[PDB]
């Protein structure tokens, strides 16, 4: 296998789970009880980009779906969105910089910096039922740290 890929789930500092709101919308909320299995799993591909011992360049796409997380500028502001990439031409090792995330691990928590937008990480508000957006204030009010849980394929 030229490009390896694993599947894992992401949770915020409040232990919230990422769920698909609309076809191209992601939300972060508390998921417990027997509703935990509604969790969305993301596939991490070993792409090409800025690599280090702490920061690893990986792609983020929905498991068994051609929906990938993309970082673009909308109205002079960097925003996150879901792009429907070619189902037969994706994924690939050399992915577009807007689809390349810099998964860093400073301590026990992991941070996802955008390769397209340096110092901009995936953020989510502390509040419940809040959507996912791109923030440039890591360690501020909005959650900028996440967890990684490997699932069964």
């Amino acid at each position: 296998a030229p490009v390896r890929s694993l599947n894992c789930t992401l949770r915020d500092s409040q232990q919230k789970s990422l769920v698909m709101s609309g076809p191209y919308e992601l939300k972060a909320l508390h998921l417990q009880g027997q509703d935990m299995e509604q969790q969305v799993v993301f596939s991490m591909s070993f792409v090409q980009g800025e690599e280090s011992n702490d920061k690893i360049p990986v792609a983020l796409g929905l498991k068994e779906k051609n929906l990938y997380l993309s970082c673009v500028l909308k109205d002079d502001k960097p925003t996150l969105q879901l792009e429907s990439v070619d189902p037969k031409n994706y994924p690939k090792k050399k992915m577009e910089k807007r689809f390349v995330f810099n998964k860093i691990e400073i301590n026990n928590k992991l941070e996802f910096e955008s390769a397209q937008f340096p110092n901009w990480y995936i953020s989510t508000s502390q509040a419940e039922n809040m959507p996912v957006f791109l923030g440039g204030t890591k360690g501020g009010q909005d959650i900028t740290d996440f967890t990684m849980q490997f699932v069964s394929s």
Partner: single-chain antibody
Amino acid sequence: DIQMTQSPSSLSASVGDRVTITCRTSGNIHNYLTWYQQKPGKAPQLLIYNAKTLADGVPSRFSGSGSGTQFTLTISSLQPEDFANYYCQHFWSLPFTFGQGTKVEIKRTGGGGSGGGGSGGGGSGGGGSEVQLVESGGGLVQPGGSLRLSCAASGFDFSRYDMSWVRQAPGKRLEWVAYISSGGGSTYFPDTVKGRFTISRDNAKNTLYLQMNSLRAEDTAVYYCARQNKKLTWFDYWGQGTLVTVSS
């Protein structure tokens, strides 16, 4: 998931022979293979890690090779003390299980007192550093019940070293149970054991607490304390193991 396949299961060689153990994976991990040695009645030890990296303190007669989807262990010179079960492992993704196990038997004609001595050196258990993990809490419990396993950590950094939990049923391979972060957040739990177990750590008493709820008959096995040492998911030190049996 990613299964493992070893060859052979058992073999007989002479003292000084070049033993070769083949290990195959169901997924092209490329370079994420681990090799462990479990002595009869003792705790398993990490001989080879990262596919081709020897452990610090491991005899030079132990060499590891392989790349891609095929790995091989090579013993430059098989000694009578090398009698044990060799189980490989992958640290790339789930389920983090071991192979079938390869047993190496030393075929000796008969030299009278052919065996060896003990283990240890100057300072062992006395004037010197000694890393030890002692688990407790095991016993016989009724199905559906609960049990709290505790592992005592000593001889090393408790807040600098991370650890995990692995179980091995009598006459079976080793299966991952859970991960217990030194920080206290990232909770790695496979869908298989998800919800069944819960981990907790005490930095004051230097002990790990494993809460086992809604135990099933398939949970019957030995629980060994596993410890890491880097940023990768590998164990370099195993505890003695606590036997847990669920019956009526």
